[PDB]
Amino acid sequence: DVVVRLGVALADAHWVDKTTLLWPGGENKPIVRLYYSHSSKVAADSNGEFSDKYVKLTPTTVSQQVSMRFPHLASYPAFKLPDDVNVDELLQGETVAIAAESDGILSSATQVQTAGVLDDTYAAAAEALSYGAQLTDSGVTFRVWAPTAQQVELVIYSADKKVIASHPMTRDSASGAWSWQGGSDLKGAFYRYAMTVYHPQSRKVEQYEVTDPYAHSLSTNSEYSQVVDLNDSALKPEGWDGLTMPHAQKTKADLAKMTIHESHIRDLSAWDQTVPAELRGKYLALTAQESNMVQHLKQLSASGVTHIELLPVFDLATVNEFSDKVADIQQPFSRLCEVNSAVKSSEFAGYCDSGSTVEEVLTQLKQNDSKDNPQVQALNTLVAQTDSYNWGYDPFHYTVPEGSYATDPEGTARIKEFRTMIQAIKQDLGMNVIMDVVYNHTNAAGPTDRTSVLDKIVPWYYQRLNETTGSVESATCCSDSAPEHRMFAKLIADSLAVWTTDYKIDGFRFDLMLYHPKAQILSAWERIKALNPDIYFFGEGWDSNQSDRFEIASQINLKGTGIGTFSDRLRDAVRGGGPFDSGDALRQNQGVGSGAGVLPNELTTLSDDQARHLADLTRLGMAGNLADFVLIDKDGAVKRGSEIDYNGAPGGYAADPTEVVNYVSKHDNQTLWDMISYKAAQEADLDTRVRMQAVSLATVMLGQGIAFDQQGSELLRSKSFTRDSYDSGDWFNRVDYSLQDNNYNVGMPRSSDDGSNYDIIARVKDAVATPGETELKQMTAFYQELTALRKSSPLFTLGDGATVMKRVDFRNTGADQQTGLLVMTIDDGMQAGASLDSRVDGIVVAINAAPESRTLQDFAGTSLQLSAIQQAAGDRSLASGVQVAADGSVTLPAWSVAVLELPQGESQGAGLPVSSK
Numbered sequence: 001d002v003v004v005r006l007g008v009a010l011a012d013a014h015w016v017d018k019t020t021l022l023w024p025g026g027e028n029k030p031i032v033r034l035y036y037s038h039s040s041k042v043a044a045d046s047n048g049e050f051s052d053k054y055v056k057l058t059p060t061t062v063s064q065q066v067s068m069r070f071p072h073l074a075s076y077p078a079f080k081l082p083d084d085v086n087v088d089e090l091l092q093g094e095t096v097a098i099a100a101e102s103d104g105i106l107s108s109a110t111q112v113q114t115a116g117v118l119d120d121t122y123a124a125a126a127e128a129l130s131y132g133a134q135l136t137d138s139g140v141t142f143r144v145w146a147p148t149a150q151q152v153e154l155v156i157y158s159a160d161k162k163v164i165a166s167h168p169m170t171r172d173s174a175s176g177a178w179s180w181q182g183g184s185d186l187k188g189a190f191y192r193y194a195m196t197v198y199h200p201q202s203r204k205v206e207q208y209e210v211t212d213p214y215a216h217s218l219s220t221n222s223e224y225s226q227v228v229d230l231n232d233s234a235l236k237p238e239g240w241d242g243l244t245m246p247h248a249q250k251t252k253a254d255l256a257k258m259t260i261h262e263s264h265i266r267d268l269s270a271w272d273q274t275v276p277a278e279l280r281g282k283y284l285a286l287t288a289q290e291s292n293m294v295q296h297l298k299q300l301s302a303s304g305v306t307h308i309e310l311l312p313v314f315d316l317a318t319v320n321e322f323s324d325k326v327a328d329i330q331q332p333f334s335r336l337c338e339v340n341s342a343v344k345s346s347e348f349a350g351y352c353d354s355g356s357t358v359e360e361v362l363t364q365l366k367q368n369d370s371k372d373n374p375q376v377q378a379l380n381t382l383v384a385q386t387d388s389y390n391w392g393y394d395p396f397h398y399t400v401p402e403g404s405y406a407t408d409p410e411g412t413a414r415i416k417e418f419r420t421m422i423q424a425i426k427q428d429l430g431m432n433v434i435m436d437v438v439y440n441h442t443n444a445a446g447p448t449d450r451t452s453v454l455d456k457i458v459p460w461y462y463q464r465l466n467e468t469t470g471s472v473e474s475a476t477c478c479s480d481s482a483p484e485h486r487m488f489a490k491l492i493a494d495s496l497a498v499w500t501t502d503y504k505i506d507g508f509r510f511d512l513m514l515y516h517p518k519a520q521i522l523s524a525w526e527r528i529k530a531l532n533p534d535i536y537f538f539g540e541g542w543d544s545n546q547s548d549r550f551e552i553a554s555q556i557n558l559k560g561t562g563i564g565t566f567s568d569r570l571r572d573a574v575r576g577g578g579p580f581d582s583g584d585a586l587r588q589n590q591g592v593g594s595g596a597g598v599l600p601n602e603l604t605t606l607s608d609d610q611a612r613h614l615a616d617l618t619r620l621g622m623a624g625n626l627a628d629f630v631l632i633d634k635d636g637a638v639k640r641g642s643e644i645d646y647n648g649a650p651g652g653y654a655a656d657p658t659e660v661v662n663y664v665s666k667h668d669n670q671t672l673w674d675m676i677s678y679k680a681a682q683e684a685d686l687d688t689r690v691r692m693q694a695v696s697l698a699t700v701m702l703g704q705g706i707a708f709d710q711q712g713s714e715l716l717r718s719k720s721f722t723r724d725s726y727d728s729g730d731w732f733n734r735v736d737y738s739l740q741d742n743n744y745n746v747g748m749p750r751s752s753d754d755g756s757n758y759d760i761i762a763r764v765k766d767a768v769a770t771p772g773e774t775e776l777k778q779m780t781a782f783y784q785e786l787t788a789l790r791k792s793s794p795l796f797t798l799g800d801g802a803t804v805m806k807r808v809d810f811r812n813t814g815a816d817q818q819t820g821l822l823v824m825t826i827d828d829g830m831q832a833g834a835s836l837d838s839r840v841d842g843i844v845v846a847i848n849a850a851p852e853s854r855t856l857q858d859f860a861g862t863s864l865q866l867s868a869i870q871q872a873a874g875d876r877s878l879a880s881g882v883q884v885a886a887d888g889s890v891t892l893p894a895w896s897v898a899v900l901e902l903p904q905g906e907s908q909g910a911g912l913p914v915s916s917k
């Protein structure tokens with residue numbers, strides 16, 4: 001045969017199943033071959049010939065199975081391998097697709113992406129097995145999937161990290177998994193997998209030790225995995241096996257009551273001097289029953305907050321778990337200098353031999369901090385490199401608790417402490433627990449990074465790659481994963497199963513769910529429902545550009561599935577603007593909650609029509625953002641929810657309100673208070689802004705969607721205008737449970753991301769006083785009033801979309817509406833069906849997001865009464881000053897919220913029937 005002669009570039013050939021290669025470079029070329037070398041690079045010798053073995057490819061047509069699996073490759077020129085190819089032999093080393101002209105002169109040569117053929121060859125067999133260090137009756141079975149590795153050894157380490165054994169593992173030909181079976185004496189042992197494996201990024205047969213991707217226990221800072229039996233009673237708090245979910249999640253009416261408090265382990269306790277010092281920033285702070293923080297959460301729970309959602313508490317990578325390598329702001333500046341060489345070489349080096357703590361230094365820097373001298377963030381940006389603080393969207397191991405939140409990060413101790421926290425939240429605080437999970441990316445990839453785990457063990461399989469270059473994509477921020485590949489889908493479901501069964505997690509929030517296939521999220525839900533039939537899944541289902549590779553798990557595509565998604569519709573209508581706003585747009589783009597139209601600031605050009613459009617989105621969201629809900633829009637037109645525009649997209653997208661998570665604040669982007677501070681008119685005084693915060697939250701808390709909120713909205717939480725505070729430390733993320741202030745105006749935010757906002761910040765920042773104890777207590781009262789109202793009646797939380805459509809309506813709609821007045825009715829009368837609430841025949845929710853008093857005549861002649869919960873709050877109520885006249889007319893003061901009711905008599909009454917449209 002013809003010798004190819006006369007280098008390798010890119011990686012645009014795709015070996016997608018046993019006998020199919022997709023490659024643009026082989027088109028119309030007469031000689032197309034797949035060369036391979038076990039132990040070196042497919043390269044030309046001194047002669048210039050390609051002497052490595054090869055498999056010849058013949059042009060062919062893309063099969064239907066291939067086009068279904070990889071629609072983004074379906075137009076690639078297809079080539080067929082001989083049916084007798086030993087795929088397992090080729091996959092052990094480098095493969096290169098080579099095209100040549102009829103004489104054998106090289107036309108192009110490229111590397112091969114093999115994830116498709118790996119799935120087609122091994123995935124079914126490998127999916128039938130279980131992975132990790134698995135303690136059994138007979139002892140232990142280790143198993144790791146590594147279908148391309150040339151060798152795998154199990155390295156066993158002593159407690160002091162001395163090698164005590166290195167065991168060659170046994171490869172299973174059908175699955176490509178490696179196993180090793182031993183005695184029960186290996187319980188508690190540390191271990192890694194010694195890999196000998198070709199990595200296409202380096203084109204080397206690499207040799208390295210890697211922790212177990214199915215690790216369930218770790219040494220300090222995740223350097224070694226550890227054999228554990230999570231069922232061990234020594235790893236459980238007393239009574240763990242009997243722990244029950246305090247809030248039901250079985251029916252859609254159950255789910256709709258979900259009211260989420262999105263929290264972070266350090267944000268909760270890092271500043272609370274009434275938490276024991278040894279527990280600040282730890283899981284166990286939730287057991288400090290006498291602390292300000294825990295007492296505050298207990299009162300929130302009593303008032304109707306039902307779920308704590310935890311920011312990453314799986315093993316993140318971006319905090320060093322070796323305490324001697326970390327300095328926090330409560331510690332001496334001298335400690336910071338000894339762990340942080342960037343500080344020691346900085347303009348702040350003069351503080352190294354001082355006797356001040358870092359937070360004492362930051363405090364003194366506040367007075368002269370400004371846009372022209374952003375020195376608080378200058379020092380804090382250095383502190384952030386070596387402190388204990390990160391949101392943790394940086395996955396190191398998916399199925400071990402984070403070590404730095406434990407009092408002892410070495411070994412199994414963190415498992416019991418994590419469970420002690422979960423038990424404290426459920427049994428002692430009475431709230432369910434949601435975990436934020438981040439399967440959409442890894443912290444790192446490639447053969448060299450300390451935190452690259454999956455991509456060292458099966459290179460180029462667990463990460464999503466560019467079709468041409470083979471580079472790991474970074475749409476997520478970081479190292480994009482590939483949940484469309486079967487063995488990572490399995491890893492995800494197996495991981496969720498441990499969190500569900502062994503840690504008793506009640507629901508899961510999928511970070512960047514839009515990068516997952518719809519089919520994969522649904523398959524995971526099917527598998528977890530077998531373990532916990534009431535588990536709830538939701539996530540960020542924005543529109544993504546992965547739609548060319550598979551049907552994405554988005555808001556639109558999840559309609560009717562029961563998987564929830566955050567809604568950005570009510571969020572942006574009430575907050576104003578969008579997450580991408582910068583500069584003067586942050587002030588111009590007022591929301592319903594900050595007086596769009598009705599209380600304009602000096603920069604906005606918002607029209608009355610535009611303000612009323614935001615109210616349409618807000619009403620639609622209060623009714624659960626349903627595609628088929630019927631309302632009267634700003635022009636008097638009859639519209640389904642899907643016909644209300646949201647930046648060119650159909651606004652209403654859901655089938656049931658339990659598919660919609662409404663919110664006006666979250667860990668991402670500016671806090672609600674900082675948004676109100678950007679947007680409020682200069683003449684809106686401090687007490688008005690507090691009511692703006694409460695009016696904004698009322699659209700969520702009194703709405704039919706699931707209610708979600710940021711830890712501290714009830715305390716007017718500020719991040720000093722920081723938009724993206726993931727690494728902004730204790731300083732900018734502070735929540736003060738002693739109620740002295742809301743952390744506003746503690747220095748200009750990080751210049752790298754908010755520098756473009758310094759001008760507008762300086763112009764708005766000092767408009768009114770910073771909240772103090774009086775305002776914090778009044779906001780907490782407002783907040784607990786809203787959650788208590790939501791909790792008090794099943795009419796707020798109907799759950800079923802058809803039931804919402806049969807019962808929920810709006811008044812003050814159309815072209816003659818009073819702008820900013822949101823009036824929702826919920827029917828419990830005879831035309832709705834059964835009475836769901838024996839105390840009332842109907843409810844009216846009136847939110848007057850306006851600086852005028854408003855009078856309503858819609859309920860004239862009815863028996864309407866102000867809710868007793870709000871009457872009991874007196875002049876501290878959001879309904880303070882509301883008047884219900886004899887004739888049924890109702891007057892609301894400025895910036896007020898009233899829940900009114902028709903009292904139910906001896907039999908079900910007429911109620912508030914939905915108007916015909």
Ligand SMILES: OC[C@H]1O[C@H](O[C@H]2[C@H](O)[C@@H](O)[C@@H](O[C@H]3[C@H](O)[C@@H](O)[C@@H](O)O[C@@H]3CO)O[C@@H]2CO)[C@H](O)[C@@H](O)[C@@H]1O
Nearest residue numbers: 391392393394438476477478511512540668724725726
């Ligand atoms: O150094 C790694 C990575 O750090 C930074 O990315 C972080 C984001 O800045 C931060 O906002 C957070 O992003 C997550 C959101 O909080 C979450 O709600 C959702 O939208 O997913 C995001 C990604 O998980 O965390 C990331 C990762 O730590 C930085 O911006 C990146 O450039 C950098 O590569």
Ligand SMILES: OC[C@H]1O[C@H](O[C@H]2[C@H](O)[C@@H](O)[C@@H](O[C@H]3[C@H](O)[C@@H](O)[C@@H](O)O[C@@H]3CO)O[C@@H]2CO)[C@H](O)[C@@H](O)[C@@H]1O
Nearest residue numbers: 475476477512540542543544568578579668669723724
């Ligand atoms: O991924 C890294 C990224 O994380 C954070 O950005 C997130 C936004 O904060 C968050 O609002 C969301 O953005 C979506 C909009 O909300 C939605 O209305 C629509 O426009 O889609 C947007 C995403 O396409 O998600 C992003 C992505 O996580 C963080 O703030 C960034 O700094 C960081 O770069």
Ligand SMILES: [Ca+2]
Nearest residue numbers: 384387389390
């Ligand atoms: Ca940090």
Ligand SMILES: [Ca+2]
Nearest residue numbers: 545546548549
């Ligand atoms: Ca793409």
Ligand SMILES: [Mg+2]
Nearest residue numbers: 315316317403
């Ligand atoms: Mg960690």
Ligand SMILES: [Mg+2]
Nearest residue numbers: 828835837840
């Ligand atoms: Mg009733």
